[PDB]
Symmetry: D2
Subunit: 221 residues, 4 copies
């Protein structure tokens, strides 16, 4: 009943500020919500070349794109056609801290995303300011309800140059715009986000994500 199509278009605008550095980034993409896959082309419109690792932004560029089995309530697909919003904190191991918010609507065959991303206290010689990141590793988000609110936790890690890892704790709260959307029980979403291609300074980036929900062992087998 979402009126979501097997093939959806995606438009996005992000505005934000990290360590005092302002930026605006536009995105235009497409995806398959029932296969849990999406991809997007991003262009930095203000603030480029970004003076920090593009990677920290990428998870902010929609859990509608996650393959849900029939036995787990899919809160995100049921939030539509109206939509939903999420709010996230990204707590990095060296004290960098970011918060982000997305309001997601839908017209026709298109999701519209209004994304804000603010961060500070990244050390000047850390991997983020020094642009030493290579990618996010795959991850598994733990989804559960806390005082009526769908919440997601993830231990994330950025692979660095030299092959060390730089850890980050995500916590996201998700809220349907309409009242009454039924809450799922405790479950998982596996993710893998990748930059497919980019120019030298990441002014232009092609992003891809794949996500699948599941119930853990022994169920996931």
């Amino acid at each position: 009943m979402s009126a979501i199509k097997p093939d959806m278009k995606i438009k996005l605008r992000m505005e934000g500020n990290v360590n005092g550095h302002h930026f605006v980034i536009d995105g235009d993409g497409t995806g398959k919500p029932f296969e849990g896959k999406q991809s997007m082309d991003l262009e930095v419109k203000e603030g480029g070349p970004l003076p920090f690792a593009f990677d920290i932004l990428t998870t902010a560029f929609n859990r509608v794109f996650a393959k849900y089995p029939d036995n787990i309530q899919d809160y995100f697909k049921q939030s539509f056609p109206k939509g939903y919003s999420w709010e996230r904190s990204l707590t990095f191991e060296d004290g960098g801290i970011c918060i982000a918010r997305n309001d997601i609507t839908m017209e026709g065959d298109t999701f519209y995303n209004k994304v804000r991303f603010y961060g500070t206290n990244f050390p000047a010689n850390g991997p983020v300011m020094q642009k030493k990141t290579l990618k996010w590793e795959p991850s598994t988000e733990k989804m559960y309800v806390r005082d009526g609110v769908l919440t997601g936790d993830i231990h994330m890690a950025l692979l660095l140059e030299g092959n060390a890892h730089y850890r980050c704790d995500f916590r996201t709260t998700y809220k349907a715009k309409e009242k009454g959307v039924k809450l799922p029980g405790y479950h998982f979403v596996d993710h893998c986000i990748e930059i497919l291609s980019h120019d030298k300074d990441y002014n232009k980036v092609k992003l891809y994500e794949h996500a699948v929900a599941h119930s853990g062992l022994p169920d996931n087998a």
Copy 2:
């Protein structure tokens, strides 16, 4: 460069839990006494749907009494100025990031303030407005990776006598190169809403701050 009696002009724009607002400030202080106060008026998005107290530390470390034996980073930052960025991490998962760009012209400090906040639970003391005041505090000032940083254990006193904790981390950066960094030291703070109309569209705010070196010196 810094006068004993200074004025303060301020504009804040911000968004907390999806709610946009703009607040203007006009005040005065005595930089060498560590004192200031300001009148605030909500110009847009009023009355705020959340506790005004979360905003008050965002409304200038130039207003702190520094003794002779501690480098005063802030007073040395003028006339060019400095800026600060701060995370406010509340215990129920509410999180804000605030920043201020502070310039000077004649006897007046200008402050351009941004305040962004997410993840305050609908039933927590912030959205339910159960806050009474911040407790006084002692900020620990130190240097990390070349940057002057302050951490503070903050707490808001609540209706019903409990406290709601918040961890502050602020980075401070002089606009001019080669301003000399101080060593590890402390700044005691007391901030207080002296008065306010019913809905907090208008607020009179006061702060007192004194830098020190901890025991056994203090």
Copy 3:
């Protein structure tokens, strides 16, 4: 390695102290290292009945029992006959902190486990001290190397009476006793741990665990 047999026995003694409460717990179990499964009977020997939730103890009662595929280096199985030890911090959401450690050796077809578990700062009214826990949820541990030391991080959650969850961050460091045990790259271990039965005061508990390593999406 040839040191690990398809059926292994387990002997275990745990001593610890939680919120000033001393206890000792014995255990005797069996597992199937290549199936990723094990099972144990535990008995409280001193300090029973425990005044706190038995669940906080259960992950302290051996990553050898995890099913590893061929394309991921299996540090745990590789570490025998000599063995390995691990040390873990359990940081619960209300300020309760536990520190646990196991030193694991092998004699014949048996793992011997020297386990310590210590805990402080559990609020008297919290679910641990009030015994409101029902079970750990299944979990996914992130395994990576930090400074030449194999490390696992896990977002764990205890399901509580009333349907809410009580959160805990695990961080475990694993150290082979010998130097020449090749380190794996970044990978995952799914876990599911379960108390199969227990008597009223948890003086006697039967415990079970199933674990499987994988490499995340798209492989799986």
Copy 4:
């Protein structure tokens, strides 16, 4: 009930990153003056393969000078005593927990102390013994769910002049029923290793602590 001059007897047992140790302490102090010192001797585990500094705040809040306008929980706990439990969360993932049970008879405080630590990085400043001292600090004392609790932003000064931060959360509980709880207040602390032998098998330790109510009261 507490004398102006008290003896202190202590033993600590613990284990950091898998290394076991037993340490004995014999000291004296002046409870009403907030001053204390103690001679420590390593009895087992010597020489310690980690920074002795991480242990020193586990080696009694009765030794803090309280003004009359703040309820002194610790002194009011005696003769029966009290216990404290602490978590020490280091910025690099090192974490310790500690507990002390404190009793008294006549002129002597007795201490039964346990200290456990883990996940310190083999190359970090604790395992490499690159710490110099703790900075002075200010502990925020407040009541949470009927329990007196203290939070501190601690920092170890390191060789090379960086600071290694630690967050301390302590809860304190009187043994006897009905000890009245204080309002929100502060305790300034300064701890110092006065002298030590080469591998810290023997150490002289000193602390001074003074409770206060923050600005403006000073």
